[PDB]
RNA sequence: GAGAGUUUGAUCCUGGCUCAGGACGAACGCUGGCGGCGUGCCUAAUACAUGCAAGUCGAACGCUUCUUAAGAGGAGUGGCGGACGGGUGAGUAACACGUGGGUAACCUACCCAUCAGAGGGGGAUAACACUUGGAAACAGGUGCUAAUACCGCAUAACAGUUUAUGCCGCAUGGCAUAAGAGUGAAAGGCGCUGGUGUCGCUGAUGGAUGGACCCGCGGUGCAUUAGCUAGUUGGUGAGGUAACGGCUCACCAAGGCCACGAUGCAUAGCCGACCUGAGAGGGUGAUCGGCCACACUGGGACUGAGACACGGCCCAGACUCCUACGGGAGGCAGCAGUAGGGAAUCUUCGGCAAUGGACGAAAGUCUGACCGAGCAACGCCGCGUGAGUGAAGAAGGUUUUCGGAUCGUAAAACUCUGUUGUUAGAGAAGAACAAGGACGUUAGUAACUGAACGUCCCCUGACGGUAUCUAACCAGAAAGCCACGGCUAACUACGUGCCAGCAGCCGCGGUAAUACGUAGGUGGCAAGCGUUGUCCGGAUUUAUUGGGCGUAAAGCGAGCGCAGGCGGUUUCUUAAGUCUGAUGUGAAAGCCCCCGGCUCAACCGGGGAGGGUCAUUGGAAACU
C-alpha cells in the first residue's frame, strides 16, 4: 500500500477548534551562493480532540482535503 | 448555425432537453411528496418512500442523473424513513 | 563558389609554392600589385596567423565556411594533435586524393575531374570534390573517361607519389593505404598557427 | 561582501539602454499607446530639412532632417553622402547610428529607400548610399 | 480507442514511420503511448522492426491495429500469435 | 578562458567608453546561377469580399422522384461523429506549468475480457397530404405513418447501503464472505438452416485509454508597494458534486495570512528546448512536441461518456448587413486571400495516392489534418561560373626616380572538360493495402453460413514524365559586395583645401590628406556582401566560481541591542545537512556519443549517453 507524506513540526497556533498550525522548519541551499538557509513551511492539521498545545512537537500525515486549508492529520505528540 | 448537422443537433438537443427536464421534474416531485409526508407524519409514507426510491432509480436509468447521484439520494431517502 | 582567378599571385601572397614546383615564386618572389617589389612594414602576428591559415585553404581550394567546418570536426578527434588531424582530413578530401594518386597535375584539375564525374569511388561514381575518402577506398577513373589525354599525361608525368598511397598505373585505381603523417605532408605549413588563428 | 550579505541582498547589474531608443517603440493607433517593438529601421516624415553645425573641433554644414516617425516620436536624423533630394513632408527611412559631430543626432537616413534617392556619382561603397551598379 | 498505428517521420519525399501505440484522438505526429516498432517502406523488401511482446501485450489489452500495421503484424506472424492466444 | 584602442608632456594605477567573435522568424542597400533540406504577420486577440476547412450510415425506420422492376437520387426520423484534428496566445505569477508524489474523496463513449440477460405491451411523432400567416427568415393548423424514436409493466442487485462475522490499514477506513430490506434494464438488423452465424441492445465487473482533484519542491520585477482578509479561518449539521472541500447555506467561534515578502502594482502563457559562454551563468520561449488558455466583447445553460463547445443554442453589447419597418442575418486567432497597421513575412494552387482521423458490415463518403506543388537567397548544406600548357612578360590601365614597374600566366594562343546549360531519348521507389475471387486451419455448431487466423490470384500514384539515368552539342549563357590611418588582413596616384564630406572608437579635412571623392592596385568573404536592430561574449563592468572600500567609487558620527548569521574542548548518541549503493522516474524530437541511409553534406534513421539541489529504500558517520 502506498504511503503519504509525514512531517515533524511544532504547533504555533491552537486557537481554532479541532485544528492546529504546524511548522516544519527545513533548510535549503541558496541557488547561487550555496549557503544553507532556514525555511519555514507551515501546515494546517485536523486535531481530533484539541490535544496538542502551542509549542508542542507533533507529527502529521497527509490526507484528503478536510477544509479549505486543511490537508494533514495529527499523528503523534512527540514532545510537550 | 452554418453546418447542416449542427442545425439538426439544435432540434434534437432541444427535444432531448424537454424530455430530460420533464422526467427530472417527475423525479423531484416524487421525492418532494415523500419528504413532505415525513414532515406531516402520514400513513402511506411507506408507499411514497418506495415511489421515491423507484423514481430515483428510474431517473438513473435514462441517465438523467448519475449512478452515484442516485445512490446518494437512496441513502438519503432511507435515512428519512 | 570556386576561385578561378590567377594562380601565381595567390602563391606569392603566401610566400610558398601551392603547386609544390616553384614556378610561381621563381620570378618576382614578392606579393602581387605595384607595392610588391619594394619594402613594407612587418606583418603582425594576426597577419602571420592569417597567412598560415590562408596557405592551407588556398592549397586545397576550399572556401572559408567549408574550411571552418572541417576544422571543427578535426577538433572532435580525441587522439592526436588538432592541427595534424586537420591536415589529414584535408588530404582525405576526394579532391586531394585524386591529385595525390597522380590522375591530375594540379588540384584544380583534380577538382575538375571529380566535379565533372570522371572519378569513381569503390566502383561507384562520386562527383563531390569535398567527399571524404576512408583508408582503403579505391579511387578510379570512369570507364568512359580512362582514355583522355589530360589524365594520361598526368599519369605519366608524375614520377613521384606519397608513401601513404597505393596506385596502379594500368587500372588507374589507387588508394591511401594509411593516414598521412605530418612529415609526409607540407612541412612548411605551420598548423599550430592555424589552430591559434581559429582559437581567436 | 560576506556570503550572508549576498544571500540577503544579491548582486544586481547595471541595466543597459539603447543607443537608438526611437527604434525600440512602436505605436498602436487603436489604444493610442506605445508598443515595445525592436525595429531595425523606421519610416518617418521629414518635418524640417536643413543644415547644422558640428561641435568645436570640427566645422562644416552637416545636413540633417527633423523626422517625425511613424511611432509619433520626433527625432533628428543625418543625411549621409554628398547631395540629397529630401524636402519637408518627404517620407524617409531611418536607421540607427549616432553622428559624433552632432550632439542631438542619433539616426541616419537610409539612401535609396522610400523617397530618399541614391547618391549621385557614387562609385565605391555603393551599397551604402544606395546607388545601383553603373 | 487505443490504436497501434504509424507515426510519419523522415524528410519530405522520404517517409519513415515508427509503429506506436497511441490514443485515437492524439495527432498523428503528436502524443503517443509507446513505440513498438519501425516501418521503412522505401526498402524494396520493406524493413520492419517489431517489439513483438510489446505489440502482443497491447493487442491482448484491446489495442486496434491500423490497416497497414495489421498487414505489418501479419507478415511478422504476431497476428497469428494473438489468434492463438485468444484460443 | 588570447585581446586591442582611448584620460598624461611622459608614467603607473584606477576607470568608463569603444572594437575584433558568435547568433537571428530579421529588415534594409548593392548584387544574384543552380540544387537538397528547412523557414516565412514578430506589428492590429485590427476589420474582413469570395471558395473551401465534418460529416456519415438504406445492413435502424417509414416516404418520395425517376431508371424500362432493376439501378440512381431527393429530402424525414433515428444512430454515431461534430468536445478530435486545425488556429491563436489575448488572459493568466496560477497547482497554469515543470518535476516528485498522493486519492482508503473520483469519472471514463468508442476498444478488449468476463458473468448475466435480451421477456411482454403501449401511446405517439415528423416525413407525407392538404391548409394559415410572412417580404424574408421561418413559424403554425388539421389529418395520417415507421423504427434500433419514446413510455409503461415484468424479470434481473453481480451496484449501493445496513448488519454479522473474519482479515487488514494510514484517521476517516479497506477487502472478502453471508444475510437482509428498497428499487432499478433492453432492440433489433443482416444472413444461413424452431435452432444458429454475425453486427448491434441491457445489467455487473476487470483491463486499457482519456479525464478530474489534492500535496512537496522549482522557474519575473517594485516596499519610493505592510498590512491584507470577513465565507474571510475553523467548527457543527444540512445541501450539492464523479468526487474531497466554505463548493454553497444556516448556525457557533474567531481566526487566517504576512519582512522566510502577505496585499497591491507592473510584466509574462509554461516546458522540452534554442542562442551564447571555458564554465558558473546570461538571453530567448519562432518553426517541431507536451501542457494550459482563448475563439467578435460579456454572461448562461442545453445536449452529451466527454464542451459550458472556433465554423452549436440563448441573452446583452459594439460592428457589418438584409427588410415590405413587423422583423431577419453574421463573426477567418481554420486553409488561401483582401484592407489596414508595419522596416517586415507566401498561392484565393493539386490530391486524397500515402499516413492519421469521422461514419459504415463493406465498397465507400468526408478530411485546407495531412501529403504535394507555387512564391521569397529568409536560413543551412552541396556544386558551379571552367581545366592544362602558355612571354624576361603583347597590347591597353595605373604609376614612375622615365630606366622600368605593376595589373600578369592574367589575356591571347593551342589542347581539353560537360558538374551545369541545351537538345533529344530512357524511366523510379514511395502500395501497404481494403474490397473481391480461391482454398486451408483453429474454436463453436446437429449441420451449417459466418467469426478468428493462414496461403495464393486480383486490385489502387496527387506528386509526375518528378527524381534519376543515358547520349549529343557548346565555354559557350552563369559575380559580386565591403574594406585597405591605428585597432585590423590590405597603398599608391590624381581631385578637393576645416569646404565638400568621413567616422565604431581614437579622430580625419585649414592648397603636397594611404582617413573625404575617383582610379589603379590590394585584402577579406563569396551567390552573396555590407548596414541597421536585438541577444551572449569579450566585461573580474555585481566578481558563487571571480573584485573592492587610508589617499582613485566605497567604513554608517558613535554606542546599546531584538531577530538573524557565525561560534571553544570533549564522551555517547542521533542523522536533518553531507557522502554513497540500488530501484523508480526525469516522454519523443533536439545537442553529444557510436552506428547506418541519402553520390557528399545539410538532412534522415537506429542504438546509447547526458540531464534532477527528484522520490523510495539500504548503507557510512569525519564534518555542520
Ligand atoms: K444525422
Ligand atoms: K584621446
Ligand atoms: K581600458
Ligand atoms: K457526439
Ligand atoms: K505539482
Ligand atoms: K462546514
Ligand atoms: K499569453
Ligand atoms: K473570453
Ligand atoms: K464546432
Ligand atoms: K486519406
Ligand atoms: K465538402
Ligand atoms: K492504404
Ligand atoms: K579607415
Ligand atoms: K567574491
Ligand atoms: K568611523
Ligand atoms: K546525516
Ligand atoms: Mg554556398
Ligand atoms: Mg569608406
Ligand atoms: Mg515496396
Ligand atoms: Mg500573431
Ligand atoms: Mg500577453
Ligand atoms: Mg431506445
Ligand atoms: Mg422497472
Ligand atoms: Mg565569462
Ligand atoms: Mg471561423
Ligand atoms: Mg547533364
Ligand atoms: Mg595592417
Ligand atoms: Mg579613402
Ligand atoms: Mg560577468
Ligand atoms: Mg577626494
Ligand atoms: Mg574616496
Curated annotation (Swiss-Prot), chain A:
One GO MF term, please? structural constituent of ribosome
Q: Name one Pfam family in it.
A: Ribosomal_S17
Keyword field: Ribonucleoprotein, Ribosomal protein, RNA-binding, rRNA-binding
Of the GO CC terms on this record, one is: cytosolic small ribosomal subunit
Where along the sequence do coiled-coil regions lie?
A: none
One GO biological-process annotation of the entry reads: translation
Query: What top-level branch of life does the organism fall under?
Result: Bacteria
- InterPro entries this protein is in? NA-bd_OB-fold (IPR012340), Ribosomal_uS17 (IPR000266), Ribosomal_uS17_bact/chlr (IPR019984), Ribosomal_uS17_CS (IPR019979)
How it assembles, according to the record, is: Part of the 30S ribosomal subunit.
- Give the matching HAMAP family: Ribosomal_uS17_B (MF_01345_B)
Record function comment: One of the primary rRNA binding proteins, it binds specifically to the 5'-end of 16S ribosomal RNA.
In which family does this protein belong, per the annotation?
Answer: Belongs to the universal ribosomal protein uS17 family.
Name by which UniProt lists this protein: Small ribosomal subunit protein uS17
Curated annotation (Swiss-Prot), chain B:
Which UniProt keywords are given for this protein, alphabetically ordered? Answer: Ribonucleoprotein, Ribosomal protein, RNA-binding, rRNA-binding
Q: Which Gene3D superfamilies match?
A: Ribosomal protein S20
Q: Keyword RNA-binding: yes or no?
A: yes
Instruction: Tell me which InterPro entries the record gives.
Output: Ribosomal_bS20, Ribosomal_bS20_sf
What's a Gene Ontology MF term here?
structural constituent of ribosome
Signal peptide start-end: none
Give the GO cellular component terms, alphabetically: cytosol; small ribosomal subunit
Q: Name one GO biological process term.
A: translation
SUPFAM superfamilies for this protein: Ribosomal protein S20 (SSF46992)
Q: Which Pfam families match?
A: Ribosomal_S20p
Name the family the entry cites. Answer: Belongs to the bacterial ribosomal protein bS20 family.
So what does this one do? Binds directly to 16S ribosomal RNA.
Q: What is this protein called?
A: Small ribosomal subunit protein bS20
From Swiss-Prot, chain D:
What is its quaternary makeup?
A: Part of the 30S ribosomal subunit. Contacts proteins S8 and S17. May interact with IF1 in the 30S initiation complex.
Q: Which PANTHER family match?
A: 30S RIBOSOMAL PROTEIN S12 FAMILY MEMBER
Highest taxon of the source? Answer: Bacteria
Q: Which family does it belong to?
A: Belongs to the universal ribosomal protein uS12 family.
Q: Which GO terms describe its biological process?
A: translation
Region (Disordered), start-end ranges = 1-54
Q: Which residues carry this modification: 3-methylthioaspartic acid?
A: 101
Task: Provide GO CC annotations from the record.
Answer: small ribosomal subunit
Arranged from A to Z, the UniProt key words for this protein are:
Methylation, Ribonucleoprotein, Ribosomal protein, RNA-binding, rRNA-binding, tRNA-binding
Any GO molecular function:
structural constituent of ribosome
Name listed for the protein in its UniProt record: Small ribosomal subunit protein uS12
- Known function: With S4 and S5 plays an important role in translational accuracy.
* A Pfam family it matches: Ribosom_S12_S23
Q: Where is the composition biased (Polar residues)?
A: 26-41
The source organism is: Enterococcus faecalis (strain ATCC 700802 / V583)
Swiss-Prot record, chain E:
Q: Check the record and name the InterPro entries matching this protein.
A: Ribosomal_bS16, Ribosomal_bS16_dom_sf
Q: Which GO terms describe its biological process?
A: translation
Q: Which SUPFAM superfamilies match?
A: Ribosomal protein S16
Gene Ontology cellular component list? cytoplasm; small ribosomal subunit
GO MF, any single term: structural constituent of ribosome
- Tell me the keywords, alphabetical order: Ribonucleoprotein, Ribosomal protein
Stored Pfam families: Ribosomal_S16 (PF00886)
> Per the similarity annotation, which family is this?
Belongs to the bacterial ribosomal protein bS16 family.
Q: Which PANTHER family match?
A: 30S RIBOSOMAL PROTEIN S16 (PTHR12919), SMALL RIBOSOMAL SUBUNIT PROTEIN BS16M (PTHR12919:SF20)
UniProt xrefs under HAMAP family: Ribosomal_bS16
The entry's protein name is Small ribosomal subunit protein bS16
What organism does the record attribute this protein to? Enterococcus faecalis (strain ATCC 700802 / V583)
Amino acid at each position: 500500500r502506498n504511503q503519504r507524506k509525514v512531517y515533524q513540526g511544532r504547533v504555533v497556533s491552537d486557537k481554532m477548534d479541532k485544528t492546529i498550525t504546524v511548522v516544519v522548519e527545513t533548510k535549503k541551499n541558496h541557488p547561487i551562493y550555496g549557503k544553507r538557509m532556514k525555511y519555514s513551511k507551515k501546515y494546517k492539521a485536523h486535531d481530533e480532540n484539541n490535544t496538542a498545545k502551542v509549542g508542542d512537537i507533533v507529527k502529521i500525515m497527509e490526507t484528503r482535503p478536510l477544509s479549505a486549508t486543511k490537508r494533514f492529520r495529527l499523528l503523534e505528540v512527540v514532545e510537550e | 448555425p452554418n453546418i447542416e448537422s449542427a442545425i439538426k443537433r439544435v432540434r434534437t438537443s432541444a427535444n432531448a432537453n424537454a424530455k430530460n427536464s420533464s422526467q427530472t421534474n417527475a423525479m423531484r416531485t416524487a421525492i418532494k411528496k415523500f419528504e413532505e409526508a415525513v414532515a406531516a407524519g402520514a400513513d402511506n409514507v411507506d408507499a411514497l418512500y418506495n415511489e421515491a426510491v423507484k423514481a430515483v432509480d428510474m431517473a438513473a436509468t435514462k441517465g438523467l442523473i448519475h449512478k452515484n447521484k442516485a445512490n446518494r439520494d437512496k441513502i438519503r431517502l432511507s435515512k428519512l424513513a | 563558389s570556386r576561385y578561378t582567378g590567377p594562380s601565381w599571385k595567390v602563391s606569392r601572397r603566401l610566400g610558398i609554392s601551392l603547386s609544390g614546383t616553384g614556378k610561381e615564386l621563381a620570378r618576382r618572389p614578392y606579393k602581387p600589385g605595384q607595392h610588391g617589389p619594394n619594402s613594407r612594414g612587418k606583418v603582425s602576428e594576426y597577419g602571420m596567423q592569417l597567412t598560415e591559415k590562408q596557405k592551407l585553404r588556398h592549397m586545397y581550394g576550399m572556401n572559408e565556411r567549408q574550411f571552418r567546418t572541417l576544422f571543427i570536426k578535426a577538433s572532435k578527434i580525441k587522439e592526436g594533435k588538432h592541427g595534424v588531424n586537420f591536415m589529414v582530413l584535408l588530404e582525405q578530401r576526394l579532391d586531394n586524393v585524386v591529385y595525390r594518386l597522380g590522375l591530375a597535375t594540379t588540384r584544380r584539375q583534380a577538382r575538375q575531374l571529380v566535379n565533372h564525374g570522371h572519378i569513381t569511388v569503390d566502383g561507384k561514381r562520386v562527383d563531390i570534390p569535398s567527399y571524404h575518402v576512408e583508408v582503403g577506398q579505391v579511387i578510379g577513373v570512369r570507364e568512359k573517361s580512362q582514355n583522355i589525354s589530360t589524365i594520361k599525361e598526368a599519369v605519366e608525368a608524375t614520377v613521384g607519389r606519397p608513401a601513404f598511397v597505393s596506385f596502379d598505373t594500368e587500372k588507374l585505381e589507387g588508394s591511401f593505404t594509411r593516414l598521412p603523417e605530418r612529415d609526409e605532408l607540407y612541412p612548411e605549413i605551420d598548423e599550430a598557427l592555424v589552430v591559434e588563428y581559429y582559437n581567436q | 561582501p560576506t556570503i550572508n550579505q549576498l544571500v540577503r541582498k544579491p548582486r544586481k547589474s547595471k541595466v543597459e539602454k539603447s543607443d537608438s531608443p526611437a527604434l525600440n517603440k512602436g505605436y498602436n493607433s487603436f489604444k493610442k499607446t506605445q508598443t515595445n517593438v525592436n525595429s531595425p529601421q523606421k519610416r518617418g516624415v521629414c518635418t524640417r530639412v536643413g543644415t547644422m553645425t558640428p561641435k568645436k573641433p570640427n566645422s562644416a554644414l552637416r545636413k540633417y532632417a527633423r523626422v517625425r516617425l511613424s511611432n509619433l516620436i520626433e527625432v533628428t536624423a543625418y543625411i549621409p553622402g554628398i547631395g540629397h533630394n529630401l524636402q519637408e513632408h518627404s517620407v524617409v527611412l531611418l536607421r540607427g547610428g549616432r553622428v559624433k559631430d552632432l550632439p542631438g543626432v542619433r539616426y541616419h537616413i537610409v539612401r535609396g529607400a522610400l523617397d530618399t534617392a541614391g547618391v549621385n556619382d557614387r562609385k565605391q561603397s555603393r551599397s551604402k548610399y544606395g546607388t545601383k551598379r553603373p | 480507442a487505443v490504436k497501434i498505428r504509424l507515426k510519419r517521420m523522415g524528410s519530405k519525399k522520404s517517409p519513415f514511420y515508427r509503429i506506436v501505440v497511441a490514443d485515437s484522438r492524439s495527432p498523428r505526429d503528436g502524443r503517443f503511448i509507446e513505440t513498438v516498432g519501425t516501418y521503412n517502406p522505401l526498402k524494396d523488401p520493406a524493413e520492419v522492426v517489431l517489439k513483438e511482446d510489446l505489440v502482443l501485450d497491447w493487442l491482448s489489452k484491446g489495442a486496434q491495429p491500423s490497416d497497414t500495421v495489421r498487414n505489418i503484424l501479419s507478415k511478422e506472424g504476431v497476428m497469428k500469435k494473438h489468434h492463438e492466444a485468444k484460443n
